[PDB]
């Protein structure tokens, strides 16, 4: 099986400007949103049809109540952080928790907090410690590390619970998540600035978004400057990407166990 991940984010905003909710929490499987909750709806809702038809209302009802409490906890934590820094006005507080099931069958788990979009606290589940960025993060770290049992609960959540949820959600969304759509790849040649020939290797219509594109010269790696396009969503569940060079050249594309060569 390919590599897959489960992540949940929380976003808290103090003094929100007209329109922006005070709290948002979104769940993802790889790049697909699966769940959402915000301080306006005050409801946990599916963001994928395969989540809706495989999880009973009991799930959605139970987590709505938990998210209502997590929303309140985020409100208070952000007030305490702003007091610690002597900060007024609108500030942001973020959390990211998740796990990965790697192709070799091994796992990773992470739990992180940000303040104003910058790293603040990083959990180390292998030593049960929190990594602090400054003295305010250190004050919070001392409080969190005082509760040994919450540190063990968190290790267990990341290493066992998170993985069991990921495997459950992979089964529910298998027709979308475990499918493969091969890339359509083309090489375009064009004289740009006088005396300059540009080669563009463009890929589109591929799923999953993980692709490898590289330009080779006479069979070995290029040492010249290569430009890269972002892996962009096309809107239909597929992606597009590109790689370009200047001036025997070939574009190499690897996607979901298939290697493709385009010789210019």
């Amino acid at each position: 099986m390919r590599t897959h991940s489960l992540r949940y984010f929380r976003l808290g905003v103090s003094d929100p400007i007209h329109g922006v909710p005070e709290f948002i929490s979104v769940g993802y499987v790889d790049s697909h949103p699966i769940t959402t909750y915000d301080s306006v709806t005050r409801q946990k809702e599916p963001r994928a049809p395969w989540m809706a038809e495989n999880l009973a209302p009991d799930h959605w009802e139970r987590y709505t109540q938990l998210l209502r409490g997590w929303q309140q906890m985020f409100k208070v934590e952000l007030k305490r952080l702003q007091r610690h820094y002597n900060h007024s006005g609108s500030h942001t507080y973020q959390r990211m928790i998740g796990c990965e099931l790697l192709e070799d069958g091994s796992t990773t788990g992470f739990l992180q907090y940000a303040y104003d979009g910058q790293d603040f606290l990083i959990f180390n589940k292998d030593t049960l410690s929190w990594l602090a960025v400054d003295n305010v993060a250190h004050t919070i770290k001392q409080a969190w590390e005082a509760n040994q049992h919450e540190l063990l609960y968190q290790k267990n959540w990341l290493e066992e619970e998170c993985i069991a949820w990921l495997k459950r959600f992979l089964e529910y969304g298998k027709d979308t998540l475990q499918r493969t759509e091969p890339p359509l790849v083309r090489v375009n040649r064009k004289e740009t600035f006088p005396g300059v020939t540009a080669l563009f290797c463009k890929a589109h219509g591929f799923y999953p978004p993980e692709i490898y594109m590289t330009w080779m010269k006479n069979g070995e790696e290029i040492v010249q400057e290569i430009d890269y396009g972002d892996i962009l969503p096309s809107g239909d569940g597929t992606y597009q990407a590109w790689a370009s060079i200047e001036l025997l050249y070939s574009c190499h594309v690897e996607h979901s166990g298939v290697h493709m060569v385009l010789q210019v």
Partner: antibody, heavy 109, light 114 residues
Framework: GQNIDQPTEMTATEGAIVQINCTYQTSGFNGLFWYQQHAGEAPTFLSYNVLDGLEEKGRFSSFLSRSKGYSYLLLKELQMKDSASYLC??????????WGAGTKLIIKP | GVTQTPKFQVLKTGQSMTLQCAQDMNHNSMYWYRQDPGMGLRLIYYSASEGTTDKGEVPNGYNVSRLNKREFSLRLESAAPSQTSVYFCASSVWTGEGSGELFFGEGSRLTVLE
């Protein structure tokens, strides 16, 4: 969440040792608790376990095996004051607390 | 920490009743349980934080009110003999956190007679 089994009652002698088992069959696992409840009194928290091992608190120790879905509460140097009910509870995948029917413990003087 | 009232109460069938529960531990989550012989504690209603409440396992014949952060009252609208039990109020710092234990009230013994 589904089933938590612990013996209805247990009898042991004063100054001796007793082990109270708790087996659970749940949808997910977020920790296991032991509460002590004296006759006609409120339950009081004794211990919490979520990773494998044994933790000691005075004459009381709590053990957990996640793979066997089993825990035990061990009391050493049994005293008459240990006559009480012992409740086992497990947090499932949805953080719902599933309670066991309790174990009444009788200490023979 | 957790103060619940009344300790004992005799009720006639159809009669209404309210059990009070306050905590001054700054806990966000509050619960109402009933304890019956031979079974595990059964959650009636719970309040994950101030401003929200939800049904537990046995909500029928009951209703709750999270009045503020400190108080969670349980109401018996029309008492039935099946509601004869020992009622416990409990609080925890939060819900949706594995290790947080419950802090129990002293108990409320309720007897419902025809």
């Amino acid at each position: 969440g589904q089933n938590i089994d612990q013996p209805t009652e247990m009898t042991a002698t004063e100054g001796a040792i007793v082990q109270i088992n708790c087996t659970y069959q749940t949808s997910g696992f977020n920790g296991l608790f032991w509460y002590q409840q004296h006759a006609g009194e409120a339950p009081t928290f004794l211990s919490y376990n979520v990773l494998d091992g044994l933790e000691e608190k005075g004459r009381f120790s709590s053990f957990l095996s996640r793979s066997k879905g089993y825990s035990y509460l061990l009391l050493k140097e049994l005293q008459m004051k240990d006559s009480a009910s012992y409740l086992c509870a497990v947090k499932d995948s949805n953080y719902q607390l599933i309670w066991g029917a309790g174990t009444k413990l009788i200490i023979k003087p | 920490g957790v103060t619940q009232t009344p300790k004992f109460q005799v009720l006639k069938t159809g009669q209404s009743m309210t059990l009070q529960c306050a905590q001054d531990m700054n806990h966000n989550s509050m619960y109402w349980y009933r304890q019956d012989p031979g079974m595990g504690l059964r959650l009636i209603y719970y309040s994950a934080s101030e401003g929200t409440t939800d049904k537990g396992e046995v909500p029928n014949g009951y209703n709750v009110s999270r009045l503020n952060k400190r108080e969670f009252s349980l109401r018996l609208e029309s008492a039935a003999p099946s509601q004869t039990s020992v009622y416990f109020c409990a609080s925890s710092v939060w819900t949706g956190e594995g290790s947080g234990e419950l802090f129990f009230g002293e108990g409320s013994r309720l007897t419902v007679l025809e």
